[PDB]
Amino acid sequence: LEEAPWPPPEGAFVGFVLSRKEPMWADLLALAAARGGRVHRAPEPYKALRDLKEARGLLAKDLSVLALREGLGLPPGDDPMLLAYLLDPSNTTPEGVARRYGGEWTEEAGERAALSERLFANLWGRLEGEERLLWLYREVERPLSAVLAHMEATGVRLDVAYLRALSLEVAEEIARLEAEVFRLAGHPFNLNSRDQLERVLFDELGLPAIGKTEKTGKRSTSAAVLEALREAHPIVEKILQYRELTKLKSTYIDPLPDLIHPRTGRLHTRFNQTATATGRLSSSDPNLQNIPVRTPLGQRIRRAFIAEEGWLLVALDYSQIELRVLAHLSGDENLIRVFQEGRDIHTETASWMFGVPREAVDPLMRRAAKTINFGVLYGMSAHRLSQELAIPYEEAQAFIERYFQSFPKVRAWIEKTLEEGRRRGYVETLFGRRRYVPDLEARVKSVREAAERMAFNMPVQGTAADLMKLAMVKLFPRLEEMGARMLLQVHDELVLEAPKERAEAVARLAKEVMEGVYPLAVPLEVEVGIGEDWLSAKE
DNA sequence: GACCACGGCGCC
DNA sequence: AAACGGCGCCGGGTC
Ligand SMILES: Nc1nc2c(ncn2[C@H]2C[C@H](O)[C@@H](COP(=O)(O)OP(=O)(O)OP(=O)(O)O)O2)c(=O)[nH]1
Ligand SMILES: [Mg+2]
Ligand SMILES: [Mg+2]
Ligand SMILES: [Mg+2]
Numbered sequence A: 001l002e003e004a005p006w007p008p009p010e011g012a013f014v015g016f017v018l019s020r021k022e023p024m025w026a027d028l029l030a031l032a033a034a035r036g037g038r039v040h041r042a043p044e045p046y047k048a049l050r051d052l053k054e055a056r057g058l059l060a061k062d063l064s065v066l067a068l069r070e071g072l073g074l075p076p077g078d079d080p081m082l083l084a085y086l087l088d089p090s091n092t093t094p095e096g097v098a099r100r101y102g103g104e105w106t107e108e109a110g111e112r113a114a115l116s117e118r119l120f121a122n123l124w125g126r127l128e129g130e131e132r133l134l135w136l137y138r139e140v141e142r143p144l145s146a147v148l149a150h151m152e153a154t155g156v157r158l159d160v161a162y163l164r165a166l167s168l169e170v171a172e173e174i175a176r177l178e179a180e181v182f183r184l185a186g187h188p189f190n191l192n193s194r195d196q197l198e199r200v201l202f203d204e205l206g207l208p209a210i211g212k213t214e215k216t217g218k219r220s221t222s223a224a225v226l227e228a229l230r231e232a233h234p235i236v237e238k239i240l241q242y243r244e245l246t247k248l249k250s251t252y253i254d255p256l257p258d259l260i261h262p263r264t265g266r267l268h269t270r271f272n273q274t275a276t277a278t279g280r281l282s283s284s285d286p287n288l289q290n291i292p293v294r295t296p297l298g299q300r301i302r303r304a305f306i307a308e309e310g311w312l313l314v315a316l317d318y319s320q321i322e323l324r325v326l327a328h329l330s331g332d333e334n335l336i337r338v339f340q341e342g343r344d345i346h347t348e349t350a351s352w353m354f355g356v357p358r359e360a361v362d363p364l365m366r367r368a369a370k371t372i373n374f375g376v377l378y379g380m381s382a383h384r385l386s387q388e389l390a391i392p393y394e395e396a397q398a399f400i401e402r403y404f405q406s407f408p409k410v411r412a413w414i415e416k417t418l419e420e421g422r423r424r425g426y427v428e429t430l431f432g433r434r435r436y437v438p439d440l441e442a443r444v445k446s447v448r449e450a451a452e453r454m455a456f457n458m459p460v461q462g463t464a465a466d467l468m469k470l471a472m473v474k475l476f477p478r479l480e481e482m483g484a485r486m487l488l489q490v491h492d493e494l495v496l497e498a499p500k501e502r503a504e505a506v507a508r509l510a511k512e513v514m515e516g517v518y519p520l521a522v523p524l525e526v527e528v529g530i531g532e533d534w535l536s537a538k539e
Numbered sequence B: 001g002a003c004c005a006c007g008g009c010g011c012c
Numbered sequence C: 001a002a003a004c005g006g007c008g009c010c011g012g013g014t015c
Helices: A045-051 A060-069 A080-087 A094-101 A109-126 A131-154 A160-185 A194-204 A223-229 A234-253 A296-302 A321-330 A333-340 A345-354 A363-377 A382-389 A399-406 A408-424 A445-482 A500-515
Strands: A002-004 A013-018 A028-035 A038-041 A270-272 A282-284 A311-318 A426-428 A434-436 A485-489 A493-499 A526-531
Touching (some): A013 A060, A060 A131, A131 A445, A160 A234, A194 A234, A345 A363, A363 A382, A382 A399, A399 A408, A426 A445, A493 A500
Antiparallel strands (some): A311 A493
């Protein structure tokens, strides 16, 4: 390309090199831009950010986030990763996309600008005639990238002192457990080593092996195995308690306080827009989509996620979302009616399965009923369903056959979906997001059947993801104008921050936007709550 | 130090 | 584990 002085004209494709992948923590090492046969390299990349009107190119969102960190309003625009990811969601990395669509991801910003420009040209070509994908790009993914840049740059407030204090208390309770385990073993070992634990449980204590591990065929020590073994020996209960505590401490209590950003005083995740096979977002560095919520200690952790002083969190979560989506996709008259009538399938299952009235169903029971309801739907075995309730291969199954014959268009929807996927090589969401599933004609039954469950799950999980993305795009500007913030997405949930005085109004508005995003054959209901912390805002 | 593959497990 | 799906982060062998 012809070498040309910095600054580029309007509409050029940017290339940029970061010291590390996380845009909130990165040093911008280099910046360049490409357009009309010319490449322009920035002498001083931070100053040079100020000359751009938008970030247009590979990983546009990440540069935008870095710009926002520096007080610049540089929105992301076209990004070939989003075009590629819509063509085939196994397109997840710039190395891969480049190789597939016409160049090489190098460590030079100029080359990255040039690559961005030519990959955009090519990928735009490939989306010719692909009207549903183009709609997804223009109406969902491209505008969503700007929303995600703001969310990443804004961050969430964390009660650091609370977590530090909690760490010290949890350390003591862990020592009590590990000491008991070692006493019961008759010797110490590394309790964090599942290989050492395997030897102790099954060789030294002679407990029965239940299951084997997937890749290397060891005797499993997983929670399902230990649960089965609870009454065999008192060590097993102590191992389960130890695992619960150490998981929480090593994954959340300890690391999160050290990730507070020195200039914002907040915690900044990354929302990865080209990372899943179904069209969901992911969250990393750290992951804020798997913050604990279920156990007593997990609830304590979730309490550390708090609002700015004088603000409240507003948590909004779609009710029974994949079930509603499935009603629409299958057009099943019975399931449509269940929702027309305001029923709750999770609560009904929980009530039935624990034998208590609906008013006695607690959050733990509701979570177990979800496992049941989504499990059966997405192809859980009669064998595992036996054990989950868990009662027997008698009335563990039969249950599947009734579940399905109640909703006869579901079976037909699955079979239509699978037969389409075999012929086409892909399945799709309501909006035409695609997932290629080639193993549908595999000849190893276990491989083929795994593929099938992947394949029919995707239109449901993926349509739910499309809806949430669209809600985000519609909701974001409404929040800006109200002086509220969008903080987190958790698949079917949004966490917002609002000034106390406006929090109620924000909650109503956000709820209505999410409920009316794209009407289906059943209502979408959203549960909304407000509080000083993320837990109180869902309670 | 960082890489991976694994088992394991947190959330949706 | 058990053949529900989708993720990302934690703590033996290698380089
Ligand atoms: N296949 C599968 N999908 C799940 C599972 N747990 C959650 N999901 C998917 C389906 C849910 O509809 C969606 C959102 O999770 P939620 O915990 O909000 O559940 P849901 O919206 O169904 O119920 P809610 O009324 O919000 O409690 O994520 C699971 O165990 N298996
Ligand atoms: Mg929900
Ligand atoms: Mg949810
Ligand atoms: Mg893994």
